[PDB]
Amino acid sequence: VFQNFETLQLHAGYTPDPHTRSTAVPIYATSSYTFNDSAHGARLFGLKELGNIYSRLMNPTVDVFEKRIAALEGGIAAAATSSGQAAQFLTIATLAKAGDNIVASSHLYGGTYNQLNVLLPRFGIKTKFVRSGKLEDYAAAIDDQTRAIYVESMSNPDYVVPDFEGIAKIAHEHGIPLVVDNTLGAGGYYIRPIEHGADIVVHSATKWIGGHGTTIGGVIVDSGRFNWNKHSDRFPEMVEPSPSYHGLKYWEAFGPATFITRIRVEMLRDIGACLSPFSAQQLLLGIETLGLRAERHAQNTEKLSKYFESSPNVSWVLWPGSESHPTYSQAKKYLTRGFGAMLSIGVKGDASAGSKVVDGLKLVSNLANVGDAKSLAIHPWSTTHEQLSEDERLASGVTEDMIRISVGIEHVDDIIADFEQSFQKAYG
Amino acid sequence: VFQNFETLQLHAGYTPDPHTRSTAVPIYATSSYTFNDSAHGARLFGLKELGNIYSRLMNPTVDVFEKRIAALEGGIAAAATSSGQAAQFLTIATLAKAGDNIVASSHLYGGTYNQLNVLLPRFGIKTKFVRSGKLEDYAAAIDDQTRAIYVESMSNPDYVVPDFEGIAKIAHEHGIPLVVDNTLGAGGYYIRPIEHGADIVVHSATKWIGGHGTTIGGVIVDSGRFNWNKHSDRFPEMVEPSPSYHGLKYWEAFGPATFITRIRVEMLRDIGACLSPFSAQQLLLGIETLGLRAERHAQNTEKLSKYFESSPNVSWVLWPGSESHPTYSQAKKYLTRGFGAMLSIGVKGDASAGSKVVDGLKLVSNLANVGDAKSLAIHPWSTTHEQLSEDERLASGVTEDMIRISVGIEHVDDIIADFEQSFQKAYG
Ligand SMILES: *[C@@H](N[C@@H](C=C)C(=O)O)c1c(COP(=O)(O)O)cnc(C)c1O
Ligand SMILES: C/C=C(/N=C/c1c(COP(=O)(O)O)cnc(C)c1O)C(=O)O
């Protein structure tokens, strides 16, 4: 047992196996695992014994990655997926089925919005979007078919910080879990939603968790704290005999691990959005420095917001740590280890000034990603949120003059100098 | 243009890029691809220009994998998935939505059956199973909500070969595509369903395509031969303005590549079951020997069926090249380059005779996989088909005494000798 993020990110969930004593995690580039005998195979498939069967469901490299992220977020267990989008999809598909709905903040990553608003309705799963952040609107949107409340721990790219505890209380009084996308909380370093009532946490490990922009992946973290038996009227599949496994009852067999066990033995087994062990190993190398990177990211982001605030060329600065931020009181309560790695800005001049400043950058990179160690910038109105209508973009805090900046871990003087010379060129 | 499988498996879909001139396919371990300028990023996201955006959707290593398989199967294009299960799920989820159904053969790999019988119904998508293989029963099952016919080119694990041409006509005359799971066809080497009417081909690339049991992966191959416009009454999303892309009309923009385009810009984008480049490079190493391996696999299987036919300890041999096989007339018609890499057997003795024989093998491995270069054996009643009810296993051809054998490319004498010594320990 360790308390400290900086120790867990190096040590949790792995012990050198006695056979090789390998200090680093091996890459188990295998699809299969040989049975000891026929009866052993029968027990593994019959869920009468834990053990490796097939890498669509489990892999010892992926397993270290799952346990470590679980330990950092404070959950009991995790399941890795092939992407952050798949982490969201498998979660929602386990909680809900045709005829159900979920309640969700309207401030979302554009891919999430399109998934909730376009894809899932094809399967009879609808989403009601709440724009205000007000507790009473979240409560009003819930009905008898609702199966979750869904929010981002810091919305991409306007950085709304939700009232985690208030929203969790509403969810729990209605008998539904709170699902938090904690991607912008950097693996639990900036924000730890399970400590504030979240029942399930999903991540795009592609971002800060991975940290180096090499690898797509996602992960689903189960708090173990939602009582599926007590709320079985909304979730009968969690307690009733399972058609997939000859009347197996998940709650009776697995208890607090019921949700994440279903994710694995039903959803990964049948949807098949599994993570490669090569990908897991790249994510593990990033996790080994997650706290150090997230610490420098937030320091650079703070200094860079100061420079932007006093710049004659900057119209506005959106940074969650600012006392003029619309949700500063939530940010102050929940972000006590740095106010994130992100800021957005609007620049002065005509409609083409935003592109001229980005295109003039020579150190910052213009691409679709966040949470690289390299500094990035993009115009989300035309990119990450392009699929939404203009009204849905504005309802998500995405404006047409906004430049989203993912602040890297380069020396902050070089980042500042890069904008400062790009400003000279577009203005004077 | 090359004709020959043996040449395509080494050359199709890749030319050394002029910058590095790398003869082998590089591993593009990157999440992102830097824009030339802001306008370029907007053109990419707007689907106005072809180009790398983000590895959840596209990756140059994965692109070679996709093009090479499409060329080997005779399709216009392909999309990779994280697993064979994901390939099937994304395909059906694009053809069907809540309220729709598909018609499928009852002779299915157990995970596919569970997908169709248990998972997809939760999304309002039901499956009607046909047990007889009779053209009339396939036709009687279709109704106005049907969206495809689904068959395996050689069913796992009784090796029923369908009447491809007859079934493809039933599908096309009712306005629906024939979707064929060609996993046991070995990437098109043994069977090329598109030559016999199939519109969409799915593989588990985990099997013979990869050929070394290192990597999970899937692929979807579009023939480009199904007129979505002519059948827009059953598939309106193929022609009607798309809510994901501001009214874009897919058929009008992409024509015969419409289905495979939606797989990428809708399903891989939103479900996110993508393949990593490390996985793709492993599978490309497989594909470079696929014809050589499949040829040796089938030579060994033929000789091994001969050995089993004349063994006193064997009760029955099930091999699609046998003139006694139930669908031998289909097999003789569609399998002209070797009768596959699989056989099944039942052994004399009590209930525990099959386990005695498998457990006594020292060269053949007892595990869950087919299509490894190493020879494999398993008991599908308690493993790959365990989730099915007894009646469902029997209607898929699976019985309790069945030993499924994936014949490897070891020297056939060592394979035979392995069975001999296990036969002598268990039968005196
Ligand atoms: C292969 N399924 C194997 C399970 C270990 C087996 O031993 O048969 C398979 C699949 C699933 O593909 P993934 O395992 O998700 O890549 C799909 N269709 C067929 C016909 C298979 O054999
Ligand atoms: C290019 C994509 C970026 N976003 C990703 C993302 C995902 C989706 O996660 P995968 O990309 O599927 O791993 C989920 N949740 C959040 C808050 C995200 O930011 C981007 O914003 O620029």
> Is B163 contained in some domain?
yes
- Interior angle at CA A101, CA A96 and CA A107, nearest 5: 110
Name the residue at shortest CA distance from atom 5 of ligand 2: A204
* Cα A113 to averaged position of ligand 2 atoms, centre (Å): 11
CATH code for the domain of B391: 3.90.1150.10
Distance CA A88, CA B57 (A): 16
How many Cβ atoms are within 10 Å of A324's Cβ, its own excluded?
10
Distance CA A228, CA A234 (A): 9
Distance CA B28, CA B16 (A): 14
> Is B2 contained in some domain?
no
The residue among B203, B220, B270, B285 with the most chain A CBs within 10 A of its CB, best to mutate, is B270
Which of A45, A81, A123 has the CB atom closest to B386's CB atom? A45
Give the atom of ligand 2 at the shortest distance from the alpha carbon of A157: 21
Distance CA B156, CA A73 (A): 42
> Is B6 contained in some domain?
no
Pocket test for ligand 1, best of A31, A54, A266 (most atoms within 8 A of CB): A54
> Is B4 contained in some domain?
no
Q: Does A218 touch chain B (CB under 8 A)?
A: yes
DSSP string of A55-77, one letter each residue: TTT--HHHHHHHHHHHHHHT-SE
> Is B307 contained in some domain?
yes
The residue among B216, B279, B356 with the most chain A CBs within 10 A of its CB, best to mutate, is B216
Residues sharing a CB contact under 8 Å with residue A151, sequence separation 6 or more, in sequence order: A104, A105, A162, A167, A178, A179, A180, A181
Q: Does B85 touch chain A (CB under 8 A)?
A: yes
Structure tokens at B424: 């002598």
Pocket test for ligand 1, best of B204, B344, B406 (most atoms within 8 A of CB): B204
Residue A347: what are its φ and ψ, rounded to 5°?
Answer: -110, 165
Structure tokens at A108: 């979302």
Q: Are A81 and A228 members of one domain?
A: yes
CB contact under 8 A, A379 and B42: yes
Residues sharing a CB contact under 8 Å with residue B19, sequence separation 6 or more, in sequence order: none
Distance CA A419, CA A426 (A): 11
Longest dimension (CA), chain B: 78
CB contact under 8 A, B215 and A358: no
Omega into A18 within 30° of 0, i.e. cis? no
Distance CA B361, CA B379 (A): 14
CB contact under 8 A, B41 and A366: yes
- Give me the residue label for tokens 């115009």: A379
Distance CA B217, CA A272 (A): 9
Exposure b/e, B146-184, CB count within 10 A at least 16 = b: bbbbbbbbbbbbbbbbbbbebbbebbbebbbbbbbbbbb
H-helix segments, A325-384 = 328-334, 353-360
Instruction: List the beta bridge partners of residue A81.
Output: A218
CB contact under 8 A, B118 and A244: yes
Q: Of the candidates B286, B319, B354, which is a domain's last residue?
A: B286
* Cα A256 to averaged position of ligand 2 atoms, centre (Å): 29
Q: Are A146 and A13 members of one domain?
A: yes
Q: Does A26 touch chain B (CB under 8 A)?
A: no
The residue among B28, B83, B89 with the most chain A CBs within 10 A of its CB, best to mutate, is B83
Nearest to residue A242, comparing CAs of B128, B118, B384, B124? B118
The residue among A52, A101, A109, A216 with the most chain B CBs within 10 A of its CB, best to mutate, is A216
What is the enclosing helix (H) or strand (E) of A103? strand A101-105
Pocket of ligand 2 (CB under 6 A): A 83-85, 109, 111-112, 152, 156, 181, 183-184, 204, 206, 216, 218, 368-370, 384; B 54, 56, 272
Nearest to residue B180, comparing CAs of B225, B237, B231, B119? B225
How far CA B73 is from CA of A14, B156, B206, B241, in Å, comes to 43, 20, 17, 31
Distance CA B157, CA B184 (A): 10
Q: Are B304 and B244 members of one domain?
A: no
Structure tokens at B64: 């070679």
Q: Are A121 and A230 members of one domain?
A: yes
Omega into B157 within 30° of 0, i.e. cis? yes
Distance CA A183, CA A218 (A): 9
CB contact under 8 A, A366 and B34: yes
The total of structural domains in chain B comes to 2
Q: Does B377 touch chain A (CB under 8 A)?
A: no
> Is B8 contained in some domain?
no
Q: Are B61 and B131 members of one domain?
A: yes
Closest CA–CA distance from residue B33 to any residue of chain A (Å): 6
Q: Are A164 and A229 members of one domain?
A: yes
Nearest to residue A146, comparing CAs of A179, A176, A116, A113? A176
Contacts of B38 in chain A (CB under 8 A): 354-355, 358-359, 366, 379, 382
Structure tokens at A177: 């879990």
CB contact under 8 A, B83 and A210: no
CB contact under 8 A, A31 and B214: yes
CB contact under 8 A, B84 and A386: no
Closest CA–CA distance from residue A382 to any residue of chain B (Å): 5
Residues sharing a CB contact under 8 Å with residue B150, sequence separation 6 or more, in sequence order: B92, B102, B103, B104, B105, B116, B127, B179, B180, B181
How do A402-406 and A376-378 pair as beta strands? antiparallel
List, as own/partner pairs, every contact residues A129-134 make where C-beta atoms lie below 8 angstroms and the sequence separation is at least 24, other chains included: A129/A104, A129/A105, A129/A395, A130/A103, A130/A104, A130/A105, A130/A106, A131/A106, A131/A395, A133/A105, A133/A160, A133/A162, A133/A163, A133/A327
Q: Are B106 and B252 members of one domain?
A: yes
Distance CA A383, CA B324 (A): 60
Contacts of B54 in chain A (CB under 8 A): 368-369
Q: Are B278 and B300 members of one domain?
A: no
Instruction: List the beta bridge partners of residue B366.
Output: B377
CATH code for the domain of B221: 3.40.640.10
Q: Are B346 and B275 members of one domain?
A: no
Query: Which ligand sits closest to the CA of B209?
Result: 1
SS3 assignment, position A6: helix
Pocket of ligand 1 (CB under 6 A): A 54, 56, 272; B 83-85, 109, 111-112, 152, 156, 181, 183-184, 204, 206-207, 216, 218, 368-370, 384
Contacts of A80 in chain B (CB under 8 A): none
Instruction: List the beta bridge partners of residue B81.
Output: B218
The residue of chain B nearest to residue A111, with distances taken between CA atoms, is: B270
CA B90 to chain centre: 13
Q: Of the candidates B286, B308, B339, which is a domain's last residue?
A: B286
Q: Does B46 touch chain A (CB under 8 A)?
A: yes
Q: Are A252 and A311 members of one domain?
A: no
* Cα A125 to averaged position of ligand 2 atoms, centre (Å): 21
CA B428 to chain centre: 41
Distance CA A272, CA B81 (A): 9
Compute chain A's Rg from CA coordinates. 22
Q: Does A52 touch chain B (CB under 8 A)?
A: no
Q: Of the candidates B251, B286, B321, which is a domain's last residue?
A: B286
Q: Are A361 and A395 members of one domain?
A: yes
A350: left (phi over 0), alpha (psi -120 to 50) or beta: beta
Distance CA B77, CA B262 (A): 12
The number of residues making up chain A comes to: 428
Q: Are B372 and B246 members of one domain?
A: no
Name the residue at shortest CA distance from atom 13 of ligand 2: A84
Structure tokens at A4: 């400290």
Closest CA–CA distance from residue B46 to any residue of chain A (Å): 8
Distance CA B423, CA B428 (A): 8
Distance CA B114, CA A57 (A): 15
Structure tokens at B426: 């268990």
SS3 assignment, position A130: strand
The secondary structure of chain B, three-state, reads CCCCHHHHHHHCCCCCCCCCCCCCCCCCCCCECCCCCHHHHHHHHCCCCCCCCECCCCCHHHHHHHHHHHHHHCCCEEEEECCHHHHHHHHHHHHCCCCCEEEEECCCCHHHHHHHHHHHHHHCCEEEEECCCCHHHHHHHCCCCEEEEEEECCCCCCCCCCCHHHHHHHHHHCCCCEEEECHHHCCCCCCCHHHHCCCEEEEECCCCCCCCCCCCCEEEEECCCCCCCCCCCCCHHHCCCCCCCCCCCHHHHHHHHHHHHHHHHHHHHHCCCCCCHHHHHHHHHHHCCHHHHHHHHHHHHHHHHHHHHCCCCEEEEECCCCCCCCCHHHHHHHCCCCCCCEEEEEECCCCCHHHHHHHHCCCCEECCCCCCCCCEEECHHHCCCCCCCHHHHHHCCCCCCCEEEECCCCCHHHHHHHHHHHHHHHHC
Q: Does A398 touch chain B (CB under 8 A)?
A: no
What is the enclosing helix (H) or strand (E) of A221? strand A218-222
> Is B136 contained in some domain?
yes
First to last CA, chain B: 58
Q: Does B33 touch chain A (CB under 8 A)?
A: yes
The residue of chain B nearest to residue A364, with distances taken between CA atoms, is: B34
Domain that holds residue B208: 13-286
Gaps in chain B (C to N over 2.5 angstroms) fall after: none
Say which amino acid occupies B11.
H
For this entry, resolution in Å reads 2.2
Say which amino acid occupies A220.
I
